[PDB]
Every structure is written in structure tokens, then in C-alpha cells.
Amino acid sequence: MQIKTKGDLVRAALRKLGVASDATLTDVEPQSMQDAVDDLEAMMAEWYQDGKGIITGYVFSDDENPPAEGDDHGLRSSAVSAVFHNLACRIAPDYALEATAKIIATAKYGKELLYKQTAISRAKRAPYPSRMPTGSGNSFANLNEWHYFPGE
Amino acid sequence: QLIAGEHIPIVPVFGEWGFVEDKEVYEGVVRLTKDGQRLRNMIMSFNAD
């Protein structure tokens, strides 16, 4: 992917907005880019609820290394589009803007597709209750005196 | 110690007795209802909960 850093993500979001790109004659001053990177970090941290949210492989920047922009985001090839579409939607209000309908639809689709595989993994069935008999047709358990499922 | 008689003094009583594959099996009347009764106990306990 050509989009390999948090600033690359922000640049793609701004280009999707139409605020600034490589072709424009006016560009955003770097405080704006730093604010957008802070917005991206806050959004990703809110998504990834300390390990219980959306799993993406995103690497949160450390304060010791100074510039967040320039750090690789660590996302897979398939999450970049979702993340930067959501970022465009999230940082549109800074510039007195409203993300267009196509951008909003793509943001929804990307977030859902991001959670799809983790939802499939998290859809698990709990073990048998502690009061559930093992069955006399299991032979091994009957002979080992393990007539009831442990549970929990 | 020699004891009286020509036979071993222990007499066994069997229920449903047989050999399956060179292995003894003997069964009463209770072995075969344990599954149903355990299930009934479990379902009654679930309903009481």
C-alpha cells in the first residue's frame, strides 16, 4: 500500500474531503495535520476499547518518539480504506464541512467489514452447564466416574 | 489352612449375567435408567431455578 503512515492516512482523508491534496494550490498548515492525527489516534483508541473493541493491528504512537505523523499505522491492506473514510467523516466538522453521502456510506461499510471477522471469531458457544450429565453412552466418562460436565 | 468341604464356601447370585467378548457383564435393573433419571433431575432443577 502507498498509504503507510498516520499522516498518509490523514492526507488521504483530506483528499477525499477535497480540502487538500497533491494537486491543490493551497495546503493545510502542519498544525492542522497534527490536529487530524490526534483525532485519528482518539478515534482508533475509542474503537479499540482496551482490547475489547475492533481489532485492526493499529499501533498507537508513543509520546517519547515525538512525531506521530511518520509512524507506520500497522493496519492491514484491507483496513486502510475504512479507517481513512471514517477519519474524513470525523474531521469534516473542523473545516465547516459535512462528509458527502458516498463517503458516509463507505465509512459504514468499511467499519462493518472491519468488525466482520472479529465478530465471527467472538461468536463462540459456552460449555455445558455444571448440572448437565455426560451420558452413559460415552463409556470413557462413565468408567472414569465423570458423569457431569464441569461447566463455567 | 485346610477347610471343610470340596467346594469354595462363597455363593454368588447374579442378575442379568453373560460374557460379551471374553469379558463378564452383569446388570441389575438400575444400570439402565440412570440416564433418564439424571436428565429428569437436571430438568427439574433447571425449572426450579
3-state SS record for B30-43: CCCCHHHHHHHHHH
Amino acid of residue A63:
D
Residues 6+ apart with CB under 8 A from A56: A44, A47, A48, A75, A76, A79, A83, A114
Q: At what angle do helices A6-17 and A30-47 cross, to 10 degrees?
A: 100
Answer whether A68's CB lies under 8 Å from A37's CB.
yes
For strand B24-27 and strand B16-19, is the pairing parallel, antiparallel, or unpaired?
A: antiparallel
Answer whether A103's CB lies under 8 Å from A12's CB.
no
Answer whether A115's CB lies under 8 Å from A54's CB.
yes
Nearest chain A Cα distance for residue B14, angstroms: 21
Residue in chain A lying closest to B33 (CA): A136
DSSP A126: P
Answer whether A135's CB lies under 8 Å from B36's CB.
no
DSSP H or E stretch at residue B24:
strand B24-27
Q: What is the resolution of this structure in A?
A: 3.1
If one counts every other C-beta atom within 10 angstroms of the C-beta of residue B5, the result is 6
**Rounded distance between C-alpha atoms, residue A85 and residue A104, angstroms:** 8
Residue in chain A lying closest to B37 (CA): A133
SS3 content of chain A, % helix, strand, coil (to 5): 50, 5, 50
State the sign of the Cα–Cα–Cα–Cα dihedral A32, A36, A37, A39: positive
Instruction: Give the technique used to solve this structure.
Output: cryo-EM
In three-state secondary structure terms, A72 is strand
Answer whether A105's CB lies under 8 Å from A81's CB.
no
**Rounded distance between C-alpha atoms, residue A118 and residue A113, angstroms:** 10
Grid cell listed for A62: 508513543
Nearest-by-Cβ selection for A132 from B34, B35, B42: B42
Using the Cβ of A2 and the Cβ atoms of chain B, whether some distance falls under 8 Å is answered with: no
Q: Do B34 and A136 touch (CB under 8 A)?
A: yes
- Chain A residues with beta carbon closer than 8 angstroms to that of B45: 131
- Chain B residues with beta carbon closer than 8 angstroms to that of A149: none
Q: Do B39 and A133 touch (CB under 8 A)?
A: yes
For residue B35, give the nearest of A45, A128, A148 by alpha carbon. Answer: A148
Answer whether A41's CB lies under 8 Å from A61's CB.
yes
Residues 6+ apart with CB under 8 A from A130: A148, A149, A150, A151, A152
Cell numbers 453412552 correspond to A137
**Rounded distance between C-alpha atoms, residue A13 and residue A92, angstroms:** 9
For residue A130, give the nearest of B48, B40, B41, B42 by alpha carbon. Answer: B42
Grid cell listed for A102: 458516498
Answer whether A61's CB lies under 8 Å from A68's CB.
yes
Answer whether A21's CB lies under 8 Å from A15's CB.
yes
Answer whether A28's CB lies under 8 Å from A106's CB.
no
DSSP H or E stretch at residue A9:
helix A6-17
